[PDB]
Ligand binder design. Structure first.
Ligand SMILES: [Mg+2]
Lengths: 247, 255
């Protein structure tokens, strides 16, 4: 990587990445845990980099009607980027098409709702009532895991729920009440810390990792993997999570 | 790429380390001598990918570490580097020393370093306290991951712990010594949780520390890594890893 330039796919997803839309230029528009990881990788490996957001602003999923990807995954497959630098969740659909780096964080699917004393105990109960609406963000990992789960009642949840645009839209809808938002534990923990009237529905389910995405046969995988492992071993990943997560 | 596992015969490095692997020393032949969480993973991989296999233990019965004097490896790591095996099928901890020499598969379990103690009277809150006292002896298993992490920790007091402690041969020796009392054994969370479930007079020394994974070990440039990784990810996504841990890890406690 010494002398190399990496085009890095990313999107805003706090606290992993924050993207300033004004008042900044280039790489300095980005901040967060993933940015701090990238900065240190760049310093230690000697590459320059830039961040490239997908035009559709999605993480990426495989459309089963067209068999085409979108989001950051598609940009990587199209060779618009060399690596996806974000909290990229590991799933088998993506693994068919791309590789992952060594992982930096366990994560699960988590569901939350506004209003203390919710009667719900598990998300599948949502199918048997009409007091609460619910949803997941389109073309993002939770949607994919629910659509691929063995119990096709999870596909019903996705298909019969609201398709949310992004985290801001989801949180807005959640705060409007009578709405169960299903997403990822670490993202919900950070972003809903001050919402004392938001509570969990059931326990977390599904076991996966956050990692970076790499194209198959990338010449950079071995080095990125080594360095990410060293970050974890040296305590850097935990230090960054303490820095960035609330609170 | 083009190469896959159908019709291949894999030599798999392993050792007993309950509940990941159990090895029967009599009354069995070949693969039937092995059982445990990792064995169940291997059996399913072999059914789905179409390879046959055998397990090969290192003669030294070590997991594997790098000797800084000789610059040579030992244990399962050395057998893999020497092409005696194709993959290390065990709870193989991820560490940077090993990563310089081998690759890892997609991981199947987060783990940390855990210290436990047996003894009445004053006790300890954090392992470095061992260095300023002589009531307790302590140890790590030689050529196993906990020793490597403590020796490579940037606070060299952890190297003092290794150098001034007892070099324990294996898990049975370590647990026997722990049960003898006035001893702190430093090893890995999941192994200690499983094996010390009914030791009501064994307690924690502080919280777990260090963050790493259990995975399988693969030689660099292995043609089988992509397939093994894909299938291990699917095991995790389908809940198979969690189901196996529930099956194999000890529960209740008479404590
Ligand atoms: Mg993990």
């Amino acid at each position: 990587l010494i002398g190399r330039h990496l085009r890095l796919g990313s999107v805003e997803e706090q606290p992993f990445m924050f993207f300033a839309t004004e008042g900044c230029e280039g790489n300095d528009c980005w901040s967060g845990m993933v940015n701090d990881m990238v900065v240190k990788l760049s310093e230690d490996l000697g590459f320059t980099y830039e961040y490239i957001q997908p035009d559709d602003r999605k993480f990426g999923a495989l459309n089963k009607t067209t068999n085409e990807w979108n989001g950051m995954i598609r940009d990587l497959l199209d060779d618009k980027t060399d690596m996806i630098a974000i909290d990229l969740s590991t799933n088998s659909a993506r693994k068919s098409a791309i590789d992952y780096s060594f992982p930096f964080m366990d994560a699960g699917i988590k569901a939350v709702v506004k209003g203390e004393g919710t009667t719900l105990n598990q998300v599948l109960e949502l199918l048997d009532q009409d007091k609460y609406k619910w949803g997941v963000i389109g073309s993002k990992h939770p949607e994919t895991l629910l659509k691929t789960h063995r119990d096709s009642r999870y596909s019903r949840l996705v298909d019969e729920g609201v398709e949310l645009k992004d985290l801001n839209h989801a949180i807005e809808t959640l705060r409007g009440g009578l709405f169960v938002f299903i997403d990822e534990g670490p993202v919900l923990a950070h972003n809903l810390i001050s919402d004392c009237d938001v509570f969990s529905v059931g326990e977390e389910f599904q076991s996966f990792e956050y990692a970076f995405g790499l194209p198959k046969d990338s010449p950079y995988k071995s080095l990125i993997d080594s360095h990410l492992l060293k970050f974890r071993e040296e305590g850097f990943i935990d230090i960054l999570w303490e820095k960035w997560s609330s609170g």
